[PDB]
Amino acid sequence: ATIGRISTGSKSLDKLLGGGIETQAITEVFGEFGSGKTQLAHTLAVMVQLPPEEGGLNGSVMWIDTENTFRPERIREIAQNRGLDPDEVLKHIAYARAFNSNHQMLLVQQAEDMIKELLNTDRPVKLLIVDSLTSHFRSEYIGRGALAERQQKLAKHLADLHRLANLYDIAVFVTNQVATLRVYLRKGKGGKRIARLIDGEAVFSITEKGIED
Numbered sequence: 610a611t612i613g614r615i616s617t618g619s620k621s622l623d624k625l626l627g628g629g630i631e632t633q634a635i636t637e638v639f640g641e642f643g644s645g646k647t648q649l650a651h652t653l654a655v656m657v658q659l660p661p662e663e664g665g666l667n668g669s670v671m672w673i674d675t676e677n678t679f680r681p682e683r684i685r686e687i688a689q690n691r692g693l694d695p696d697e698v699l700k701h702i703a704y705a706r707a708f709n710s711n712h713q714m715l716l717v718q719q720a721e722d723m724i725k726e727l728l729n730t731d732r733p734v735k736l737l738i739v740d741s742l743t744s745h746f747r748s749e750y751i752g753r754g755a756l757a758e759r760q761q762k763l764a765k766h767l768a769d770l771h772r773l774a775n776l777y778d779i780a781v782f783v784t785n786q787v788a789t790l791r792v793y794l795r796k797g798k799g800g801k802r803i804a805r806l807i808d809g810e811a812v813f814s815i816t817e818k819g820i821e822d
């Protein structure tokens with residue numbers, strides 16, 4: 610099945626990514642606190658809902674939040690400035706807070722039910738966000754013997770995500786505070802954000818349109 614490509618809102622970043630973030634893939638953004646990872650997530654949750662000729666996939670969204678950082682009003686704001694209706698856009702984001710890492714893993718299995726339901730409708734799920742992929746795993750797996758167990762659980766979680774991405778043609782987008790594709794993000798001068806691929810650089814600003822050049 611052809612890979613779909615979701616515009617980030619930044620032409621610079623889109624170019625770096627080869628046209629946008631890919632379906633049938635997990636794109637992992639890395640960066641320090643305040644780098645803009647969650648702003649990119651909010652922007653993508655809007656962009657994906659655009660028609661293909663405007664950089665989207667006419668898609669629905671599922672969002673797993675581990676840090677209570679999802680902001681419906683930010684979504685409304687971005688939607689308004691991208692030519693979309695803020696209420697309709699929010700309606701197409703299925704939102705869940707993950708209580709701990711085990712519940713986070715279960716929510717991915719739960720997501721498949723809605724994915725199946727919407728699959729052959731005109732608004733299939735096309736983006737699954739996990740923000741943050743690792744925050745619960747970091748806080749819970751501490752002490753002698755914990756590392757091997759943390760890593761096994763995280764591997765299983767990533768495998769579950771890859772399966773949804775590949776089986777249902779979805780872009781999975783995850784954040785990691787300091788992957789088929791790893792992107793390092795950092796805040797620079799004048800509040801500009803700079804992105805680099807791991808294993809040129811794109812530059813963008815955070816604005817009322819989400820992100821743009």
Ligand SMILES: Cc1ccc2[nH]ccc2c1
Nearest residue numbers: 675677705706707708709
């Ligand atoms: C952190 C947190 C708190 C309350 C919740 N209810 C459902 C999920 C969830 C997660």
Ligand SMILES: Cc1ccc2[nH]ccc2c1
Nearest residue numbers: 672703704705716719720
């Ligand atoms: C409503 C809903 C149900 C299951 C889910 N899994 C991930 C997000 C999510 C949202």
